[PDB]
A paper describes a structure:
GltPh is an archaeal homologue of glutamate transporters (excitatory amino acid transporters, EAATs), which move the neurotransmitter from the synaptic cleft into the cytoplasm of glial cells and neurons, thereby terminating neurotransmission events.
To test whether cross-linking limits the rates of substrate gating, we examined binding to the so-called ‘fast mutant’ R276S/M395R (FM), which shows about four times faster turnover rate compared to the wild type GltPh. The increased transport rate was attributed to the increased frequency of transitions of the transport domain from the outward to the inward facing position. The crystal structure of the mutant captured a distinct inward-facing conformation that was termed ‘unlocked’ because the transport domain leaned away from the scaffold, potentially providing space for HP2 to open. We also determined the crystal structure of crosslinked K55C/C321A/A364C/R276S/M395R GltPh (FM-GltPhIFS). The structure was very similar to the structure of GltPhIFS, that is none of the protomers were in the ‘unlocked’ conformation and packed well against the scaffold. The key conclusion from these experiments is that cross-linking does not limit the rate of the first Na+ ion binding or the rate of substrate release.
Author numbering:
A (entry chain A), B (entry chain C), C (entry chain B): 6 to 416
The structure:
């Protein structure tokens, strides 16, 4: 098969090349030949992605919850946890504000079938709150229904950790083997993630080629406007979150960045925050950080605290909804700030990662990707994912080193 | 949050306090204000309970089945197992007879929506027997359908133990790893049980507060009549089961009870038969029981043979059905004696425990808690659970010490 | 219960005895007393079998996929794997040709309820290909839907093995515990297989007794015609596959068979390819095979490469379809060759085994066992399973030793 190129560029080749192949078929031989012979491969891609969502949403958050489960962390760790959380929970809100001064999508509106998308009425507040609790975890998990799966997963991991403290040894052992299996379910799903990302050049080619064949040249303006909102969201994250909470603790932010240079760029290119752990810890020592702290937080911030992804997912959600012509009620809107945090925690730190967990923040707020409108819109961001992914990863790692430095000053 | 009180009293505070708050709103401001702002919290409680049912029904009985799976028990254990079973199977039957000379519920009848509850016709005997076998374990387990889940679980655990006897070591190896995960699934669910029981003060408050707000003071008579049927069932259990099968084997029952004093009272207050194992074994030695016998049976009787719970579940089932105006056919009636035994086996030995497993003996015999009538009735018993749980636990432990004594005499 | 006889004969007693009991009730006291009092036990049997299908289809193929998962096998193994596959993929195709020059079924036509079976239209090619990918593995697995379950299972096991190669040791470990759990799920399901095969004498008795009571005697002609197609398919397999690819590599096939004597007959009688592994390796040395080769391939060919089962399954599928009056389109027909290979890989190597995986190759090609027509036909093959199983097993083992010999010559 000989297909050995570096996935990042590889995909970008799919993206640019497929874009041109889309536009030149915008005129000339009509897009209907694309939708018949090109779209299928893109659909295969999308299917393989919103395939992984449910397993990784479950196991990932049983792990993640076990990773934060109080009490199962030194008071050094409570600090870095709370920091990590409020950095994701601010970063997503920022992504909303970027989705406010920018309207990504708005002006691209589509109805696929001459049938515009319309949301089902939100049940009573009582019934939606009660509905986050599953009635039969197996059931809820089985057929979509993401939020119950979340709640159960978190509850599970947390309980598991409290099994590991038990007097009995059969009990603690059992907790170990189980949690250890759930982890590994997740990790295997991430191996699958990578495997799909090898198909990403083709799938992207087909998706953006199809989207370019239709919709004319509207999309480029919008997609670039989204990339705008995202990145200027990220650097606003850095210059307003990190640079501000660095001076408050007496850290020189400039030199901080000069030390983080290698880790930030390495994450920027590899886009595997987990694969950019050795360089992040090399940068950990290089700036005088205690062994016992950077050995604890950086491998936690590897999988937890990906606040750049939280931002990305907020922005992406507003792009989807605006592309469909829906206005996001200030209840699902804060269900974004709430959800994209947990989706950030669940995100792998791998080339694909956050886009898959986008499915999760979209199965919430009622935008199922079984609906043609949504699936079509999701495919668009998914096409330009390769672009956003790099800087997003960069901010995911910048968060880790930042938090480590702040908790390090106080201990 | 500061909420640190002892859960038992804590809950009793919720129960009494919420009762009064119910009755004073029985007059005055109509109950409709309760149902809007108070009932939601109780509903959250009930949902959290009938949530755990399916996972614990599966894993719990895979465990339990492995715990009794012949041949994986010494003939020292065969005796104590047979005893345990016939004690649960008599105790439930006794609970039915207590639900015969007492009619708990009967005279409380309700139709919630002015629509009285009515059972779907019982299919052919052939088809109901065949239906205990699931057609696709995953499916049956997933969306309710309790009995198949049981049969599969039991078959599974039993098979697992026969893997542990296999010549091969990869086989006998893996066989544990599973069983060890399934256990731990169960045990984690019990940690969750505890966690919900920390919400129990509120949920109970809301439930009996709502029930008192409507239904007037009818309920107090009935609920107390149920408590009656239960407890006099328990003491009839002791004085007719235990006291008789103690004299048949030459044990002095009076002094027996004086030794069991500490264990029975400890169980009575902690209401955690599992948490009352150290005192049960202290009382085991204190009355001259062999190390090799009381080290085997008492930690089995901790989770298995909770025949006071079996009685409770018989009575409770008749309370539910009688509260709805349904008469229990002597076909579902013996499905109670058959089921509530298995539900006793699956019960944890934890504060909540049996209250959750009622869901199981009610998804059997066809009283799903998805039907408003049933959920309303279940909420009532569920409110006064804290009361019955104590003496019930007491009988669960008294059974354990009794059986240990008899198998010890014969060995 | 005293039921201790050797299962093989035992079942044949059920088969012959029940056959006569069927025909004498063909006249005389009409079959309706059978269908009322005899059929239920057969139905119980069938339910217990198509029960195991989904768990073993999942776990079996996660294991099985891990068993072949490249790269985690030496190039010594690549050879024997490719051989194993193309032997199964030729053997099933041969079973189709045997189902062509014989028309088994055709002329037995039945509509059980005076309603002949008719297939739902096959969706677009695009949509069936996309549909092999599951949308929510949990869901697809839960309610039937075989092929998605397969695709996910294979992807999973393969990914798991790539976890076992990971730099990290927590990862490497977790992968082990998980994969190790899925194995053991499968193996336990095979213990259940055996246990059901202890009920086989009765269930078979009831099945062929019912089938003989109706349909007159024409069934005997058809069933024996199936046995014909099967066995002469097997010996055509040997004399055209094995004997030819033995001469191509300079192996003396006659003496080869004289050495394989003990293994072939032992497999023929025990019908447990897995239980006939020690004798297969005894014959491995007895004909001068390298320790490092026959210790690797023969324990793989135990569970993988059961090409006699693949043939059996092709023939059985054509028997079903022809018994219903359906002609197998050359697309589901090659879905047979594609599927029955995987079902062969998943097959246990146990007395029951392949018949259960027949459920799988029948939920593919769209012949679900929820439709009475199919279930009635499947029950027929299932009745005469005991006969085909022996020679089938024999060919399953002959394939293993053959492959071992050839790869041994080339290395
Ligand atoms: N690739 C990002 C995560 C994402 O794509 O959302 C990371 O490595 O952190
Ligand atoms: N709590 C009881 C069981 C139950 O609540 O049903 C025990 O410890 O035995
Ligand atoms: N019994 C066969 C498998 C089957 O029945 O399909 C074997 O041992 O290989
Ligand atoms: Na994450
Ligand atoms: Na991060
Ligand atoms: Na038990
Ligand atoms: Na007990
Ligand atoms: Na197989
Ligand atoms: Na074989």
């Amino acid at each position: 098969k000989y297909i050995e190129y570096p996935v990042l560029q590889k995909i970008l080749i799919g993206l640019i090349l497929g874009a041109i192949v889309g536009l030149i078929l915008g005129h000339y031989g009509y897009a209907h030949a694309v939708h018949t012979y090109v779209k299928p491969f893109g659909d295969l891609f999308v299917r393989l992605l919103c395939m992984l969502v449910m397993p990784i949403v479950f196991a990932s958050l049983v792990v993640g919850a076990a990773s934060i489960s109080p009490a199962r962390l030194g008071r050094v760790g409570v600090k870095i946890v709370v920091y990590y959380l409020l950095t994701s929970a601010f970063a997503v809100t920022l992504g909303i504000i970027m989705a406010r001064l920018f309207n990504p999508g708005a002006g691209i509106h589509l109805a696929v079938g001459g049938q515009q998308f319309q949301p089902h009425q939100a049940p009573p507040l009582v019934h939606i709150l009660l509905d986050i609790v599953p009635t039969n975890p197996f059931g809820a998990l089985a057929n979509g229904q993401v939020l119950p799966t979340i709640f159960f997963a978190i509850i599970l991991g947390i309980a598991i950790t409290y099994l590991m403290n038990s007097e009995n040894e059969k009990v603690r052992k059992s907790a170990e083997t189980l949690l250890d299996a759930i982890n590994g379910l997740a990790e295997a799903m991430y191996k699958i993630v990578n495997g799909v990302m090898q198909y990403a050049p083709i799938g992207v080619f087909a998706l953006i080629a199809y989207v370019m064949a239709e919709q004319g040249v509207h999309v480029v303006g919008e997609l670039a406007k989204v990339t705008a909102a995202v990145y200027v969201g990220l650097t606003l994250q850095i210059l307003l979150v990190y640079f501000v909470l660095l001076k408050i603790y007496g850290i020189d932010p400039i030199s901080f960045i000069k030390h983080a240079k290698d880790a930030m760029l390495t994450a920027f290119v590899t886009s595997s925050s987990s694969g950019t752990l050795p360089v992040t810890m090399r940068v950990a020592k290089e700036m005088g950080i205690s062994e016992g702290i950077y050995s604890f937080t950086l491998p936690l911030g590897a999988t937890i605290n990906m606040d750049g992804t939280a931002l990305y997912q907020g922005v992406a959600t507003f792009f989807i909804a605006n592309a469909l012509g829906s206005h996001l009620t200030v209840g699902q809107q804060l269900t974004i700030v709430l959800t994209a945090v947990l989706a950030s925690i669940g995100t792998a730190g791998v080339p694909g990662a956050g886009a898959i967990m986008l499915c999760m923040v979209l199965h919430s707020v009622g935008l199922p990707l079984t609906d043609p409108n949504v699936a079509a819109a999701y495919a668009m961001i998914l096409g330009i994912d390769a672009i956003l992914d790099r800087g997003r990863t960069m901010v995911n790692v910048t968060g880790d080193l930042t938090g480590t430095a702040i908790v390090a000053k106080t201990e």
